[PDB]
Amino acid sequence: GVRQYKIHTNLDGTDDKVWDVTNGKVRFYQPSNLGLQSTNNIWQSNGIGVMGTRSITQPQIEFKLETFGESLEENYQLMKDFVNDILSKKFVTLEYQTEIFQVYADLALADVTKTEGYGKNGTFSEKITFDIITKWYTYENLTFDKIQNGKVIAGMSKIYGGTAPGNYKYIKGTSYTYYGESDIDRLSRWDIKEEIFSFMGILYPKLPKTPAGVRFLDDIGNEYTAIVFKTEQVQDYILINTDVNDETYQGWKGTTALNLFPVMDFERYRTRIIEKGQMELINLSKAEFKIKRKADFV
Amino acid sequence: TIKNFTFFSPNSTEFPVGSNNDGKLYMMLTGMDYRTIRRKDWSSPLNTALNVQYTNTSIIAGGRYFELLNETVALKGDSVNYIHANIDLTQTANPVSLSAETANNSNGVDINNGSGVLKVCFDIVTTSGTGVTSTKPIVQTSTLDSISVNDMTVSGSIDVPVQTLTVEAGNGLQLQLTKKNNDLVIVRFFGSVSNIQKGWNMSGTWVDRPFRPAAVQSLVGHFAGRDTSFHIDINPNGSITWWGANIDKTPIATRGNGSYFIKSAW
Amino acid sequence: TIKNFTFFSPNSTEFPVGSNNDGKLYMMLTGMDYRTIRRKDWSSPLNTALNVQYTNTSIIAGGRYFELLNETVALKGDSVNYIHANIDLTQTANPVSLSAETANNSNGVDINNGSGVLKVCFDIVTTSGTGVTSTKPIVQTSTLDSISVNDMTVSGSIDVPVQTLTVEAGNGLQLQLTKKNNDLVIVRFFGSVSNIQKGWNMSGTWVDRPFRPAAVQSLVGHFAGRDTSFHIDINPNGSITWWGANIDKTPIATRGNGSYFIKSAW
Amino acid sequence: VQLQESGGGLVQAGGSLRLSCTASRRTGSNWCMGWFRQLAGKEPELVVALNFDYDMTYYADSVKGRFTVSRDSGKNTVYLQMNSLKPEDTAIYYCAARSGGFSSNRELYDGWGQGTQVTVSS
Amino acid sequence: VQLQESGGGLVQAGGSLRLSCTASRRTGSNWCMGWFRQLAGKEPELVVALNFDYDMTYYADSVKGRFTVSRDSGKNTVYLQMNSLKPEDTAIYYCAARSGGFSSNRELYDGWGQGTQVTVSS
CATH number at residue A188: 2.60.120.880
CA distance A134 to A108: 10
**Alpha helices by DSSP H, chain A:** 72-87
Q: Which of A214, A190, A217 is nearest to A202 (CA)?
A: A214
Query: Is the same domain home to C26 and C126?
Result: yes
Give the domain CATH number at A79.
2.40.30.210
Burial of A226 (0-12, 13-18, 19+ CB in 10 A): buried
**What residues does B120 pair with on adjacent strands?**
B85
Query: Which helix or strand (DSSP H or E) is residue C216 part of?
Result: none
CA distances from B50 to B154, C2, C52 (A): 35, 51, 55
Query: Is the same domain home to B123 and B168?
Result: no
Contacts of residue A187, defined as CB under 8 A and 6 or more positions apart, other chains included, come to A144, A145, A146, A147, C89, C90, C115
Cβ-defined contact of C133 to E25 (cutoff 8 Å): yes
Query: Is the same domain home to A279 and A254?
Result: yes
Query: Is the same domain home to C190 and C119?
Result: no
> C261 contacts in B (CB within 8 Å)?
none
Give the domain CATH number at B193.
2.60.40.1830
Concatenating the DSSP letter of every residue in C91-122 gives STT--EEEEEESS-------TTTS-S-EEEEE
> E25 contacts in C (CB within 8 Å)?
133
Count CA atoms within 13 Å of residue B98 on its CB side. 24
Q: Are B219 and B257 in contact (CB under 8 A)?
A: no
Q: Is D53 left (phi over 0), alpha (psi -120 to 50) or beta?
A: alpha
If one counts the domains in chain B, the total is 2
Query: Is the same domain home to B79 and B123?
Result: yes
Contacting chains of B (3 CB pairs or more, <8 Å) are: A, C, D, E
Contacts of residue A224, defined as CB under 8 A and 6 or more positions apart, other chains included, come to A216, A217, A218, A270, A271, A275, A277
Examine chains E and A and say if they touch (3+ CB pairs below 8 A).
no
Q: Does some domain include residue B152?
A: no
CA distance B252 to C62: 65
CA distance E29 to A6: 44
Query: Is the same domain home to A127 and A101?
Result: yes
Q: Report E:18-37 residues touching C (Cβ under 8 A).
A: 25
CA distance E2 to E33: 12
Query: Is the same domain home to B193 and B244?
Result: yes
CA distance B135 to B54: 12
**What residues does B73 pair with on adjacent strands?**
B52
Q: Are E97 and E3 in contact (CB under 8 A)?
A: yes
CA B168 centroid distance within chain: 33
Angle at Cα B242 formed by Cα B240 and Cα B247, nearest 5°?
140
Concatenating the DSSP letter of every residue in E33-96 gives EEEEE--SSSS-EEEEEEETTTTEEEE-TTTTTTEEEEEETTEEEEEEEE-S--GGG-EE-EEE
Helix (H, G, I), strand (E, B) or coil at A10: coil
Q: Are C19 and C132 in contact (CB under 8 A)?
A: no
Q: Which of A176, A147, B18, B60 is nearest to C17 (CA)?
A: A176
Interface contact C161, partner D, CB < 8 A: no
Q: Does some domain include residue C2?
A: no
Q: Which of E85, E91, E88 is nearest to E67 (CA)?
A: E85
Helix (H, G, I), strand (E, B) or coil at C126: strand
Q: Are D77 and D21 in contact (CB under 8 A)?
A: yes
Query: Is the same domain home to C171 and C251?
Result: yes
User: In terms of residue numbers, what domain contains A140?
Assistant: 136-147+181-295
Cis peptide before A165 (omega within 30 of 0): yes
Interface contact D55, partner C, CB < 8 A: yes
Helix (H, G, I), strand (E, B) or coil at D87: helix
Q: Are D14 and D67 in contact (CB under 8 A)?
A: no
Phi, psi (5° rounding) for residue C247? -110, 130
Burial of A232 (0-12, 13-18, 19+ CB in 10 A): exposed
Query: Is the same domain home to A126 and A21?
Result: yes
Count CA atoms within 13 Å of residue B206 on its CB side. 22
Interface contact B162, partner E, CB < 8 A: no
Query: Is the same domain home to A125 and A229?
Result: no
CA distance C136 to C125: 7
Q: Which of D25, D16, D107 is nearest to D68 (CA)?
A: D16
CA distance C154 to B161: 7
If one counts the domains in chain D, the total is 1
CA distance B199 to B205: 17
E109 vs chain C: nearest CA distance in angstroms?
16
Q: Are B213 and B155 in contact (CB under 8 A)?
A: no
Q: Does some domain include residue C103?
A: yes
Interface contact B22, partner A, CB < 8 A: yes
Cβ-defined contact of D28 to B236 (cutoff 8 Å): yes
Q: Does some domain include residue C81?
A: yes
- Per the document, the length of chain B is 266
DSSP label at residue C18: P
Angle at Cα B151 formed by Cα B146 and Cα B157, nearest 5°?
75
Q: Which of C30, A29, A117, D103 is nearest to B171 (CA)?
A: D103
Helix (H, G, I), strand (E, B) or coil at A153: coil
User: In terms of residue numbers, what domain contains D104?
Assistant: 1-122
Q: Which of C155, C211, C178, C142 is nearest to B266 (CA)?
A: C178
C99 vs chain B: nearest CA distance in angstroms?
13
Count CA atoms within 13 Å of residue E50 on its CB side. 16
If one counts the domains in chain A, the total is 4
C-beta neighbour count of A47 within 10 angstroms: 5
Residue-wise burial string across E50-71, b where 16 or more C-beta atoms lie within 10 A, e elsewhere: bbbeeeeeebbeebeeebebee
Nearest by CB to A179, which of C7, C16, C90?
Answer: C16
Query: Which helix or strand (DSSP H or E) is residue A151 part of?
Result: none
- Per the document, the length of chain A is 298
Task: Give the type of residue at C10.
Answer: P
C-beta neighbour count of A201 within 10 angstroms: 23
Phi, psi (5° rounding) for residue C135? -135, 135
Q: Does some domain include residue B7?
A: no
Strand E3-7 and strand E17-23: pairing? antiparallel
Query: Which helix or strand (DSSP H or E) is residue C25 part of?
Result: helix C19-30
Strand B158-159 and strand C152-153: pairing? parallel
Task: Give the type of residue at A167.
Answer: N
Q: Which of B23, B26, B41, B141 is nearest to B89 (CA)?
A: B23
Method: X-ray
E36 vs chain B: nearest CA distance in angstroms?
11
Give the domain CATH number at E62.
2.60.40.10
Nearest by CB to E39, which of B164, B205, B209?
Answer: B205
User: In terms of residue numbers, what domain contains C225?
Assistant: 161-263
C-beta neighbour count of E87 within 10 angstroms: 16
Count CA atoms within 13 Å of residue C124 on its CB side. 9
Angle at Cα A35 formed by Cα A34 and Cα A41, nearest 5°?
145
CA distances from C19 to B5, C67, C146 (A): 9, 16, 28
DSSP label at residue C24: H
Sheet holding E9-12, edge to edge: E9-12, E117-121, E91-92
Q: Does some domain include residue C102?
A: yes
Q: Does some domain include residue C49?
A: yes
CA distance B197 to D46: 14
Q: What is the dihedral of CA B98, B101, B107, B110, to 10 degrees?
A: -10
Helix (H, G, I), strand (E, B) or coil at A244: coil
> E112 contacts in B (CB within 8 Å)?
none
Strand B252-261 and strand B184-193: pairing? antiparallel
Phi, psi (5° rounding) for residue A263? -115, 10
Burial of A71 (0-12, 13-18, 19+ CB in 10 A): exposed
C-beta neighbour count of E42 within 10 angstroms: 19
Query: Is the same domain home to C214 and C105?
Result: no
Q: Which of A251, A245, A199, A202 is nearest to A225 (CA)?
A: A199
Interface contact C65, partner A, CB < 8 A: no
Helix (H, G, I), strand (E, B) or coil at D114: coil
Query: Is the same domain home to A41 and A25?
Result: no
CA distance B233 to B243: 7
Give the domain CATH number at B45.
2.60.520.10
CA distance A137 to A56: 16
Phi, psi (5° rounding) for residue B14? -55, -55
Query: Which helix or strand (DSSP H or E) is residue C29 part of?
Result: helix C19-30
Query: Is the same domain home to A116 and A246?
Result: no
> D29 contacts in C (CB within 8 Å)?
none
CA distance C13 to A112: 71
Cβ-defined contact of A184 to B8 (cutoff 8 Å): yes
CA distance B160 to B122: 27
Interface contact B249, partner E, CB < 8 A: no
Query: Which helix or strand (DSSP H or E) is residue C23 part of?
Result: helix C19-30
DSSP label at residue A26: E
Q: Is B60 left (phi over 0), alpha (psi -120 to 50) or beta?
A: beta
